[PDB]
Design a binder for these strands. Structure first.
Ligand SMILES: [Ca+2]
Lengths: 81, 70
DNA sequence: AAATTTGTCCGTACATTTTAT
DNA sequence: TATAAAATGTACGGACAAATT
């Protein structure tokens, strides 16, 4: 289970949920907790572990894919690039 | 096939508008609601199309302002 | 100040592709 | 070899929030 700082907005520190998810996943990649061509957790698992909607998870992941950090295979999973 | 998902057809048409110079840089494209009406699709589909085009650098958005050709 | 417009977040349903039985 | 289950993709709907007009 990973935590969301969840501070509304206006203070300098707050990020939308999808951005906090992106940061955590990017962090796994950067710290080498996941290696290229290895599968990250499924969308359902990420939903449970982060406590957010499938939409939010897909937004984070989609951003990361368009960044080049990840790639997805329909029906297979999502992997570090 | 010839088939493309709806968000991709929307992307093609907006890109087409920009490529043919029908809208110049820093000019505003139609609103999300006008696009939903014109294409006959959901706000979600429109936002997917636009978001893809923003991420590839063809467009930029301003919350409360509109979406513009880059 | 009100209305408009984009941003975030959530829910459902079904299709498509891969993976497990 | 064939079926089911699992996992991602598309599409849709709603409610509020934030920023501009
Ligand atoms: Ca406005």
């Amino acid at each position: 289970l990973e935590v969301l700082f969840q501070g509304p907005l206006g203070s300098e520190f707050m990020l939308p949920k999808y951005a906090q998810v992106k940061e955590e996943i990017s962090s796994w990649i950067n710290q080498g907790k996941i290696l290229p061509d290895q599968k990250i957790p499924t969308e359902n698992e990420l939903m449970q572990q982060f406590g957010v909607s499938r939409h939010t998870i897909r937004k984070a992941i989609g951003d990361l894919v368009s960044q080049g950090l990840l790639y997805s295979v329909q029906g297979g999973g999502t992997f570090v690039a």
